Design an enzyme around this catalytic site. Structure first.
Site, PDB file in Angstrom:
ATOM      1  N   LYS A 134       0.712  -1.078  -0.014  1.00  0.00           N
ATOM      2  CA  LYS A 134      -0.105   0.045   0.115  1.00  0.00           C
ATOM      3  C   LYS A 134       0.865   1.269   0.101  1.00  0.00           C
ATOM      4  O   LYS A 134       1.702   1.478   0.861  1.00  0.00           O
ATOM      5  CB  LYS A 134      -0.920  -0.082   1.255  1.00  0.00           C
ATOM      6  CG  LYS A 134      -2.135   1.049   1.207  1.00  0.00           C
ATOM      7  CD  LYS A 134      -2.997   0.645   2.447  1.00  0.00           C
ATOM      8  CE  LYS A 134      -4.022   1.817   2.475  1.00  0.00           C
ATOM      9  NZ  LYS A 134      -3.473   3.140   2.839  1.00  0.00           N
TER      10      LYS A 134
ATOM     11  N   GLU B 242      -1.210  14.913   1.189  1.00  0.00           N
ATOM     12  CA  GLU B 242      -1.458  15.164   2.693  1.00  0.00           C
ATOM     13  C   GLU B 242      -0.566  16.049   3.574  1.00  0.00           C
ATOM     14  O   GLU B 242      -1.117  16.870   4.208  1.00  0.00           O
ATOM     15  CB  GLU B 242      -1.086  13.511   3.484  1.00  0.00           C
ATOM     16  CG  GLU B 242      -2.400  12.816   3.060  1.00  0.00           C
ATOM     17  CD  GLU B 242      -1.961  11.385   3.659  1.00  0.00           C
ATOM     18  OE1 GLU B 242      -0.999  11.254   4.227  1.00  0.00           O
ATOM     19  OE2 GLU B 242      -2.634  10.483   3.241  1.00  0.00           O
TER      20      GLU B 242
END
Ligand SMILES: COc1ccc(S(=O)(=O)N2CCCCCC2)cc1NC(=O)Cc1n[nH]c(=O)c2ccccc12
Ligand SMILES: COc1ccc(S(=O)(=O)N2CCCCCC2)cc1NC(=O)Cc1n[nH]c(=O)c2ccccc12
Ligand SMILES: [Cl-]
Ligand SMILES: [Cl-]
Ligand SMILES: [Cl-]
Ligand SMILES: [Cl-]
Ligand SMILES: [Cl-]
Lengths: 440, 447, 452, 448
Positions: C309, C316
């Site tokens: 992942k 962000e």
């Protein structure tokens, strides 16, 4: 001087001068504020009567007029701008003059200041009505609206307890969750919102009445405050109303409104998260996530948009409230009418949109169960459930090989010829089952 | 009386129709709808659109004239009570767009002309490029025709006081503590500059505040509109309103995906609110008293005198600051081809323009213009302050200068009289040399 | 530990600074490199002018200039220990600079009096705000604007590369008529370009310096032309043409409105960046359960539990920076509104916040451009497939088959998960009113995006 | 001057002496944004959490005892502050705080390796954990500790200083001020009792937020479900933390998904701090105005010289910062998506700073400003006795018109109301001296 006043207007000279002095926003007091000023004048008249300071006939007249006002029969008799003298004295006098005119219709002659404002000042009345209105808004309206939204979210959390889907963290595919679990999270945010409103009530419900001009209580009976509060509690059923802990804090500051605004702002923050997730789950139907279907009022998420816009407003209102809150001086904070407008609006917006959200969006949501399952079956999996079958080392080797060759854990187990006596295919699907991975 | 439509029940004297009534039932949230300037701008926009569709041969002249006549009535404020929809509606503001289309059709019907709300009144337009166009029209007009002249009025009032009070010497204040002399005129010249800078700030945002999305239709691409619809509609709007600041957007996607121009303009309004807070605060402090406060000036009576207009001003400023936070919040949260916070943003920016416009004129006329200074008293205090003994050092030493300052304060005398009372007048210091050293107006260095 | 008040041995500051250290143990954070540099620039220019006007002895002026140049060069960034949350005029940090300069000159055998020599013609009220605006102006012109231009150029490059990458639009997060990925990124580019315009438009007031107004704005105890002379020197040495004497000397000290103004610009950029960064992480979301429109470059591992992942860490970082700038902006406006009479006494807090916002935006914009935007790749075939299967593109069929039949085409395609083209075929509408040639012309999705 | 390290993404050059490893160094290069990293209190919380986790993992037989001991010992060094220079990662990192979590894991491993014990940063130091539940847990531990152990005691010190002044100045009568205009009498004591209540209410506000601020996400792992952790991992870790910190306010989250999808407890706590900043602004502003002068101001009191009101300026600047931080916190709080809010390091930076600033400035305010305040008692009383605001109780005796004349003359001649009534010859016919002194007792008027 000479003052021209409309024929059918129950207000008098000083109200009309205030109308002429503050043509700023074109907006006056809300129904809740007017109601609270009426309730306060009736209670004050009652106590002045009980203490023998006000002739019973005059008191009866005030009480009767005040009751009409608190019942909403004169909401068109309060034309003064929100942006008025920062004590709210103009609106106070507005209330005194309207009561005087109403009483005159019944053949009783009242003096606006000497009778209707007896034992009160221009400084302790409007913040009192403000906190009455805010407390009523919190207890009788917001909290039941939030409870309704909570109950609708919790109902979906139970209904969808086993609707498995893919988790998402950082917007990226993660291990399975259920739709029910997510909504259990939303319900807890709203439940905590109710806890937040309740927690502010001991200070939100503090009323300044009795402190008169500077907080000392000069020219009021020593127990005016506690007696007036008791009549207010009796008439409204609002047990959260109370006398101020410190009569100088209660007029020099409006920290109770700032505190309460913080609770509403937190609720606005939660609602933004909940609404945002919901319109994303409903997005598409081809280019989106297409997880759920929202009730139609290709459906646009109009209520989430209404919610997120309301939240934006509450955040702006919150900043305005804090700004006015900080800027009191000595014995009086003179930002009360502005602070009142913003806190009472935030209460009203949150109340009405929460009920709408609950009834016309949340209750009618439909889950796309099969699509959600296909998403869960596309989530990453882990090797941990295979440990008791193939051992920590073989599991670690499966995980490494899956990562290297970019294959699923399931297929990697098969490719490594692990399906045998220690691990059947059924046993593999059971250990890796996506609903089981969600631990619902 | 309530007439029926299809099934939805609509008030008899209502010019809106079924879609507006459904919006009324769907968003009972604030009980507050569009403000007059937004309604006016929706009228202006619908008329200009009809003019252009007629010019391009896309709309029958009879239908176009009906819309133009109807829209003009709306733009003239004749139908403000025909827009019942809540501010907190669908975030594109499509509900209010349809409200306008329906009201225009109903107005036309009374004149014998039949218009389809969508097919005719919304021709070449979408649910997404019309409402923000109206918002930026309303905001640009509010900036140019109302706020800037209001601010100019305030500037001129402050400048007039700065001139009248050119020689009104007083004690400076830093950290709230006594400091070397200034004049009241100099202070008010500072206030005037703050307001003048406010006007510069508003002017500076106009190249982007005036950008209109009209012509970009649903996503910015202009699909289902004439390729030159945008420039044509804008030219008609400029021609009719005289607002040359109105312009087609530099990028059609930025103009619908974001409302950054409103965030920018709000920042200008927020800065003005900040400036007004300082000005209003100084003035009410200067007026504090009449015994235990500063008692530097007297404010004109209205409702001694409470500073009710400085309180109105500082409360408006707080609102503008709160509104500014809400606008930025909505501004940041658009997604892909559309920002869906526009009605909330419009409400807040247009209110901020209105409050600042109205309170600035009130401030200028009913507070600033009638201020009166306690001139002799201000000079007396300046001439008695320990802050001015420093020019005595080269004559009597800073140690004796300090003794003078301490005795002047204790006995509540001028520094001059104290120097004299301490027998310092002689060959070391003549009375004319003393009056030169303690010339407090000269210390202020007024031009 | 030397004694004067106990002062660290290798400390170039003296007693008044050490007193301030002991008086304000509040945040544990002191002036930034850019503020220190600016105080150095200002002190050197002041000595230069005082010397030119024959007010200061040449050997003393030369020692200040040499010492002030070392400060401006970053050689003494550890000699400024005073908390940000100090006296609101910034007088403490002003004395800090005076004392450190005097100690440097002492090492070279020249004696300087911190107040009488280094602070000559200046006051404790027009220096620190002057240094703040010098620093803020430099941060805007030399660092923020070039960093925004770099991000603009990266976005514009992508818009060019993706000029024909057709996809479905999204409005209200729901399916809409076609756009191109290039059009969307031209939109992001315009937002950043407008941001630069916003920064540029505030510079006429951000660059105003209070220097020369001394204690209350009157210029008492300074030469009448001190301000214009100091500014002339600063402009000559720094190349910062935006620096100027204040239009009104009282406004320049009673308020910090130029900082509030500039923060408004920065806040607007934060708002733009939030939209851009949000769109981009949503576009890269998935890859199996999200939108999967683009792929972001991998920068670091995302999860221990989920080994492969990879997360959108730069978007962000950008959105968190944006939240900070909005917070800082509220602190600046708060400080700005609350001046009194001749002096706003929130300068150190306002300075901290505005300079931080410049710094964070500058740094995150370059990282965003280099480590995210430049490496983005589009999932072209995926995007085009969705566009060609969208109910929204049936409208151009109306004039050939009627809107009711077009609606039927849309409903069937959406249900049978087919392209619009194939559904028109499978319903047998290709006849004498509509060829397969005319169909492909009408359902040309790139042409529907109307790319220029 | 470097050494080679690696992760699942490949090989990474790391400073040879550095106790962190590959994933930390990737983050050092990915986020050079603010130049500031985690605070002491954050590093301490991470250390405490990692030690507690290893303790529970050992208790449940999941982690080898020799490994747990190495972790616990290493985590203690970190929590004590021996390795703060080994946490170089920017605040503005991945929004989950993943990078700082790995930072803690890597540094613990490298420390243990010095002791001869081999620990895997992921498999051992991060056992039963993910970044998504560890970093907010550390954040809420730090905030809870900041609230309970630091802020509340600092506010109590400020309250007690203000209440002491309220007692000392109980009879120091002075003119009230409303709208900045002269009003009926109050005492300095009464004003300061008001200030004390604001700070007392502040403490109540902080305490009221603790039931939710203290909620810990630990045990929910990646998405809230607890996958890859023992079912009771959270309650066990919290029990260890409570035992080691003495912070009974620390608790497991009521809902494991809310605790990771949102940081509403931080938004809530910031609201309380913001309200305190609002109160502190009022108190500080009043106090610097009271001290203003010495000639042209109010000159009610004198502030201790440490005379510029520099501590009120520090207080009101801190207040502005807290309000600013508060806006940043709510902004990040609103913008989570699905299973995770990704604004945690930024929210943590701001909430923890706001705690720190209010804690430190309240203690300074209390000790070095409030405690040493001196009142101009005689001068205050003289003004109170000379104010037109106190003629009203004479109305029934001398009439409205004369009362106004008394007020005007007293102001013009700078005399007390009492002396002006005498000078105008009103004693005798209108009222006696006894009646005059009763009606004009300004202390009695202040109802004190
Ligand atoms: C707001 O401030 C005032 C309001 C009214 C009046 S009055 O003019 O009405 N007044 C003067 C006549 C002697 C009886 C006192 C009352 C005076 C002042 N200001 C001062 O008295 C300044 C001052 N000067 N010298 C001192 O030693 C001193 C000591 C403590 C506090 C203030 C002072
Ligand atoms: C901050 O306020 C002061 C500071 C210092 C001093 S002093 O004590 O130093 N002082 C009094 C002795 C006579 C020479 C003036 C200077 C006095 C005041 N306050 C007043 O004089 C109040 C006042 N009283 N009566 C009036 O008629 C009047 C008219 C205009 C403005 C103010 C007043
Ligand atoms: Cl009426
Ligand atoms: Cl109607
Ligand atoms: Cl050092
Ligand atoms: Cl440094
Ligand atoms: Cl220039």
């Amino acid at each position: 001087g000479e003052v021209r006043v409309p024929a059918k207007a129950l207000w008098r000279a000083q109200t009309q001068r205030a109308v002429e002095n503050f043509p700023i926003s074109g907006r006056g007091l809300e129904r809740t504020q007017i109601r609270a000023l009426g309730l306060l004048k009736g209670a004050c008249a009652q106590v002045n009567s009980d203490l023998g300071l006000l002739a019973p006939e005059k008191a009866d007249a005030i009480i009767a007029a005040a009751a009409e006002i608190a019942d909403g029969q004169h909401d068109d008799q309060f034309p003064i701008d929100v942006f008025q003298t920062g004590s709210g004295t103009s609106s106070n006098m507005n209330t005194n003059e309207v009561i005087a005119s109403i009483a005159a219709k019944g053949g009783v002659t009242l003096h606006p200041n000497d009778d209707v404002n007896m034992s009160q000042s221009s400084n302790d009345t409007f913040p009192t009505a403000t906190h009455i209105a805010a407390t009523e808004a919190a207890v009788a309206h917001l909290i039941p609206a939030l409870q309704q939204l909570h109950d609708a979210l919790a109902a979906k959390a139970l209904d969808w307890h086993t609707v498995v889907k893919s988790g998402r963290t950082h917007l990226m595919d993660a291990v399975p969750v259920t739709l029910g679990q997510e909504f259990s999270g939303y319900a807890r945010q709203i439940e905590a919102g109710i806890e937040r409103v309740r927690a502010c009530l001991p200070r939100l419900g503090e009323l300044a009445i009795g402190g008169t001009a500077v907080g000392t209580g000069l020219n009021a009976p020593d127990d005016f405050g506690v007696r007036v509060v008791a009549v207010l509690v009796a008439q409204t059923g609002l047990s959260e109303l109370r006398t101020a802990a410190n009569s100088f804090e209660a007029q020099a500051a409006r920290d109770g409104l700032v505190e309460a605004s913080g609770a509403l702002r937190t609720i606005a923050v939660s609602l933004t998260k909940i609404a945002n997730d919901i319109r994303w789950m409903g997005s598409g139907p081809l280019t989106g996530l297409a997880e759920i279907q929202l009730p139609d009022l290709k459906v646009n998420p109009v209520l989430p948009e209404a919610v997120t816009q309301v939240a934006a407003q509450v955040i702006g209102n919150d900043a305005a409230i804090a700004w006015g809150g900080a800027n009191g001086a000595f014995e009086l904070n003179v930002y009360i009418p502005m602070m009142a407008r913003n806190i009472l609006e935030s209460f009203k917006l949150l109340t009405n949109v929460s009920r709408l959200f609950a009834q016309r969006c949340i209750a009618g949501l439909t889950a796309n169960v099969e699509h959600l399952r296909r998403l869960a079956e596309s989530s990453p999996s882990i090797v941990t459930p295979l440990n008791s079958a193939i051992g920590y080392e073989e599991a670690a080797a499966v995980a490494k090989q899956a990562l290297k060759e970019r294959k699923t854990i399931r297929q990697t187990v098969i490719d490594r010829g692990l399906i045998g006596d220690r691990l059947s295919i059924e046993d593999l699907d059971r250990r890796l089952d996506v609903l089981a991975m969600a631990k619902a």
